[PDB]
């Protein structure tokens, strides 16, 4: 996010972070409930990867974060690599998230749901802040 | 990348005004946002785009792609949850 500000600690309870066995954050995901995560297909998540929830400051060791394991990765099959169209994979968690004041679910809309141009929304994450 | 979580508000555009930018790369299962002075960037991917719908924050898109330079002028391109909730809806039943 180039040009964002720091979030309030635990104010986006559905945000998870995908890190490799190295502990390198490379993608973000979203909790749809305490067993499944939603992130992008292009992320290329494997099951040797771990989901992390309850995190805020990726660099603090005194934070009660939850390191969840990947059971199976579900790549939408309509996903188009050449286009990056239908870029949605689902993550099936081997070990159930424990919801709390900082770990919760995001709401999915109806295929029917409408969200019109010029509507203000919000996007969070730990992407580069400068290019 | 930054150590703690960032956030940024940003306006959703129509796909059309988007085609303006990405032209024929924008597909029906993609929805744009940004070009407001904020920009999604490397490491953002897979992450959330929420909008407030009747009290709750709803998964309106997935940080997917856009500018190589993370230009606060090009709008970013997100997954369009609305055209994919049906598959989600379905993978869960299944498993």
């Amino acid at each position: 996010i180039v040009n964002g500000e720091e979030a309030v600690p635990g104010s986006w309870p559905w945000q998870v972070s995908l890190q490799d066995k190295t502990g390198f954050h490379f993608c973000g995901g979203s909790l749809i409930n305490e067993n499944w995560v939603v992130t992008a297909a292009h992320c290329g998540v494997t099951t040797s990867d771990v989901v992390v929830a309850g995190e805020f400051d990726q660099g603090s060791s005194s934070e009660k974060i939850q390191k969840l394991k990947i059971a199976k990765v579900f790549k939408n099959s309509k996903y188009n690599s050449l286009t990056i169209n239908n870029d949605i994979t689902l993550l099936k968690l081997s070990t159930a998230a424990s919801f709390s004041q900082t770990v919760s679910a995001v709401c999915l809309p109806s295929a029917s749901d409408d969200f019109a141009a010029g509507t203000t929304c919000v996007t969070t994450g730990w992407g580069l802040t400068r290019y | 990348t930054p150590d703690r979580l960032q956030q940024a508000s940003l306006p959703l555009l129509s796909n059309t005004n988007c085609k303006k930018y990405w032209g024929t790369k924008i597909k029906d299962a993609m929805i744009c946002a940004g070009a407001s002075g904020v920009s999604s960037c490397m490491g953002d991917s897979g992450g959330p785009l929420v909008c407030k719908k009747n009290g709750a924050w709803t998964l309106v898109g997935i940080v997917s792609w856009g500018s190589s330079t993370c230009s606060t002028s090009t709008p970013g391109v997100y997954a369009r949850v609305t055209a994919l909730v049906n598959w989600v809806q379905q993978t869960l039943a299944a498993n």
């Binding site: 979030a7 309030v8 600690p9 635990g10 104010s11 986006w12 309870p13 559905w14 749809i32 409930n33 709390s100 004041q101 900082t102 919760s104 679910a105 995001v106 709401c107 919000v122 | 956030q7 508000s9 929420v50 719908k53 009290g55 709750a56 924050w57 709803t58």
Partner: peptide, 10 residues
Amino acid sequence: CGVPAIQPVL
């Protein structure tokens, strides 16, 4: 869902 315990600040 979608309604946090810690309300986000804008």
